[PDB]
């Protein structure tokens, strides 16, 4: 089960090192490209978004052709994923505990924004990126190691932005003042208000297209290193406000660095599983990855506009088991255990909760106790088979994570 190094992926070879933390299970998902699978719910959202840009977005010059990139390799450099987007070298979004690193220099993209700089650099004014993205996180019905994002970028020239106004040729895109909560230092408020208006009006119309003139949305001010001002859009769903996308006015240093210093732009990044789970009332993110026809056939529509009225699957009983152990001497991350659960338990596991931790005074070691909910999306799980999965996770935690079984 070692080496250890190398890792081979899509023909290329990645020497392992101190950053390397890809699990075999996660790599078996690379290439699957659910966003490209005809009649998959993620493919369906992608197509409806594409049609909206092609038919229903208007510009004064008028409206850009959005070139669509849904087949980019997820293997990116840390420069693509982080530095091109002005993300600081000490930013927590870079933590080994949160990202799948092939090694020091390469990784599975954590967001589709990892392609913004390159596509700008190629001179494109308007583009969509659709792709599988990869993040190390907890286990519950809303988190999965792979999910899918749709990115959009839209640049404006000065005369395009101000095209509707009389003395517009004296209005400008850029100035030299201060950054506020409302604008970057090199942007005029004249420009920012028009870009922000275009961004939100375009997203509101896309949501009305996807959902119907019924839904309740709200804009929440937030922060990203690569846009300013920035927002999340939240949809109220089952009584709770849920974020589905981040967006904002692109940081001018990013746009200038790619070679488009005569442009101002907006960008957004939407979570396809998050929206699909809301649009269709899909209760667990693991359903996107199952091949059960009770789920999948419901999204075979005659055309991408035939409304699908998702009928929820039966829920099957769960088996609950706890697992406690002594942490190794200062070398452990919660997300390592979560990776190992994914590896051994796979899609049998509905969630894992760290329920207890304490330090033992005589020994100085830390104990963790995790509660593991076993529940299959397609069938009832036998006590017998869960017992065997659980015992294997216990032994595996001892061999690989260096834990000491406390149970
Ligand atoms: N990349 C961000 C979303 C985003 C895209 C573009 C602009 C602003 C925000 C994320 O994954 O959360």
Residue numbers in the entry: 9 to 415
Give the original sentences from the paper that presented this experimental model.
Here, we report four crystal structures of HsmtPheRS mutants, and extensive MD simulations for wild‐type and nine mutants to reveal the structural changes on dynamic trajectories of HsmtPheRS. Using steady‐state kinetic measurements of phenylalanine activation and tRNAPhe aminoacylation, we gained insight into the structural and kinetic effects of mitochondrial disease‐related mutations in FARS2 gene.
Mutations in the mitochondrial aminoacyl‐tRNA synthetases (mtaaRSs) can cause profound clinical presentations, and have manifested as diseases with very selective tissue specificity. Among the recently reported pathogenic variants are point mutations in FARS2 gene, encoding the human mitochondrial PheRS. Patient symptoms range from spastic paraplegia to fatal infantile Alpers encephalopathy. How clinical manifestations of these mutations relate to the changes in three‐dimensional structures and kinetic characteristics remains unclear, although impaired aminoacylation has been proposed as possible etiology of diseases.
